[PDB]
Symmetry: C2
Subunit: 431 residues, 2 copies
């Protein structure tokens, strides 16, 4: 018997989200193409692209072929395109997801969670619209702190109760999640008044700010709890392609037999943050709610920027894409080694840290102080150094934090050495 | 005494919108630049742009200088940028708004509505976030039908009561608005339980689908009603730069002594729809709520696409921008003349229409039929022609509509002649 549980997606969709109806720009593109080519439509609502002033583009690529938009491709790049993304980018990304994650839901019926993808204007846009789709005021949601400050700022106005799940150097601790969920009975998920959690959100690789990643065994245990208590998992994975380990841990999407995982991927850290391109992968009924919200907001991701990325990826193939990933990992892993060496030299005895598993941040706990912000934004700024106090990564940002987040994306080894010399002095003269 | 009334912006901001707090990507950009240049920050959260694969760009321009992104500019184009837009585009657009509209609010205190601008990922994103900022379920809002289908689809899930204001060939009819508002007393606006309308929304030039535009005298009367009953005006003006008249009618923004107008502009019809660039202009406290929502969603408009537009506009200057506008008007006005000639020839006696004042649509009322959709999507599609039934432009899209929207953005005169021959035959053989 094929594995996986029946889902009722209506439990995870607000009344406003369910009320949305389709609003594409001129759906006649289907009735015209299949019909006669001599079919004259005065029914469309597209501006004439011959008026647009940019005419051709040439974009050079390191380790890839030059990208050229000739006259006709430029007119396409400068015109509206489908809400979920251009078809050639969607098709390539779907094949990538199948290669990397082989999701169980690929061939499910739509109504029981068939895998669907949506290109978004950055991954964070997809996450925001997912949160907005699900959360009514008073709903309970689960996540591990410290968390990305932007996620916390997105959730705050929605009025949900954020329930912290304990975490350590291997991510969320399943025993903590199990203990929290024992507040409910599993059947309470079928009774709205009981207010069982709607979802668990986590960054499973290279959490910002901690650098920690989940293990495979913990992901399996967490997934089983999500099935038992019938909550969704929001897998926000922007550092998926920045793991230092040779082998990537299987994702929640890869084990999602039920159709309860919404995954966010991004090329923001590896290909371009400024182009505003990410993508959601998840069950069709939930992805459809996000698409409909896009249709009345941004309409679509930039057609031009999608064509840039799509042409890059098609020429690279999976091989060239993974080779690029491996160059970027190599660079960040060397930066990681450099910042750890500077910490070993100058901060030993004064602070403690875990080795980042992925991403671009080192999370430093200063010993013998209750709050860092004293010796950073008032003392380190006078000595020529700035690192980020940890307070902003908690729901309660006023509580004291002895943590600093240090970035290793760009500093040279010399800059890291100086920076940690200064920090060591500050810690010393503050004890 | 300087003209304009005290505003209380809290009356137009939902609890969720007011709850938002600032969430920029690493605000340390200010403490670093003014500080010493030898200040080492490990506090930022930017990915290293040297990893990104695109290295230079060359973009040709008709009637303008070729745009070049060299190595350093490309790294900027591929990186995160500020939520409200890049500074050089904001500054140029602010000067444009001052030139075109000379808004009264330029030098007001922030708290009483100082003019502020936000570049958005298309104008519709700004409008969506404005609607979301204002509307609680059950709130009353005012607009004229027929209206852009996307606006209606955006408002539907928010649960507002849409109150139709009568409109004719000169836009909203002020006597209708006055009669509707007589349901309330002006002081009811200071009593939430009375549920006075929160805003009036309109497309004042070249309404989609009608082609009609407001007159100056009506705008003044409408503005006075907005002051008297204390509602905002949402001026959605994507065809502002596509007016066929030599002189543009003054905008609501140009008369906004109170700070009660939120204006949406777009370059989607004139420079590029696919680049997803528009902008809001409005009172600082309201624009700030939109920016904060952007900060947790799209983060910013594509940096690359903003640099393309900004470099185009700076090289053109106001003179080159207006010259481009005038070429585009010339083209669309000729298309307008062509579709009117085809209507004169083939549809006279069978339909009636008003001459479009702006934009790219002709709105045709078929005589002697209650609903068109019979003779379009089941009869015209077999004869090689498609035009858009008017039903989608009303809140009640199931009510019969004898109207068709015909686009003149692209068809040749020959295609228009054929299309209207067919439509004339269909009307004839359906009576």
């Amino acid at each position: 018997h094929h594995h996986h549980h029946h889902m009722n997606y209506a439990r995870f969709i607000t009344a406003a989200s369910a009320a949305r109806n389709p609003s594409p720009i001129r759906t006649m593109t289907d009735i015209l193409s299949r019909g006669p080519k001599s079919m004259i439509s005065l029914a469309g609502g597209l501006p004439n692209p011959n008026m647009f002033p940019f005419k051709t583009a040439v974009i050079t690529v390191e380790n890839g072929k030059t990208i050229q938009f000739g006259e006709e491709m430029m007119k396409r790049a400068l015109q509206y395109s489908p809400s979920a993304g251009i078809p050639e980018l969607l098709s390539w990304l779907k094949q990538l997801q199948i290669k990397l994650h082989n999701p169980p839901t690929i061939h499910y019926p739509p109504s029981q969670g068939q895998m669907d993808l949506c290109v978004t204007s950055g991954s964070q846009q997809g996450l925001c619209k997912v949160f907005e789709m699900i959360i009514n005021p008073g709903d309970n949601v689960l996540l591990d702190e410290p968390a990305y400050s932007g996620t916390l700022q997105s959730l705050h106005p929605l009025g949900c109760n954020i329930i912290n799940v304990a975490s350590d150097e291997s991510g969320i601790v399943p025993d903590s999640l199990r203990d929290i969920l024992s507040r409910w009975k599993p059947e309470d998920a079928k009774n709205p008044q009981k207010n069982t959690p709607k979802f668990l959100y986590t960054v499973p690789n290279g959490n910002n700010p901690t650098g920690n990643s989940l293990t495979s065994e913990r992901k399996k245990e967490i997934y089983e709890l999500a099935r038992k208590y019938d909550f969704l998992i929001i897998e926000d994975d922007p550092y998926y392609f920045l793991q230092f380990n040779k082998f990537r841990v299987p994702t929640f999407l890869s084990m999602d037999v039920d159709g309860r995982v919404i995954r966010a991927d991004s090329f923001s850290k590896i290909i371009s943050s400024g182009l505003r391109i990410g993508f959601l992968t998840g069950p069709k009924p939930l992805i459809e709610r996000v698409i409909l919200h896009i249709q009345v907001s941004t309409l679509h991701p930039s057609t031009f920027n999608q064509l840039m990325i799509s042409q890059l990826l098609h020429e690279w193939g999976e091989e060239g894409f993974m080779a690029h990933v491996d160059r970027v990992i190599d660079f960040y892993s060397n930066q990681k080694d450099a910042i750890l060496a500077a910490a070993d030299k100058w901060l030993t005895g004064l602070a403690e840290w875990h080795v980042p598993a992925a991403g671009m941040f080192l999370w430093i706990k200063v010993k013998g102080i209750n709050d860092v912000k004293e010796l950073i934004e008032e003392k380190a700024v006078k000595m020529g150094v700035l690192m980020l106090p940890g307070n902003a990564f908690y729901v309660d940002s006023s509580a004291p934090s002895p943590y600093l987040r240090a970035s290793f994306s760009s500093a040279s080894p010399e800059q890291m050495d100086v920076a940690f010399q200064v920090l060591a002095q500050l810690i010393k003269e503050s004890l």
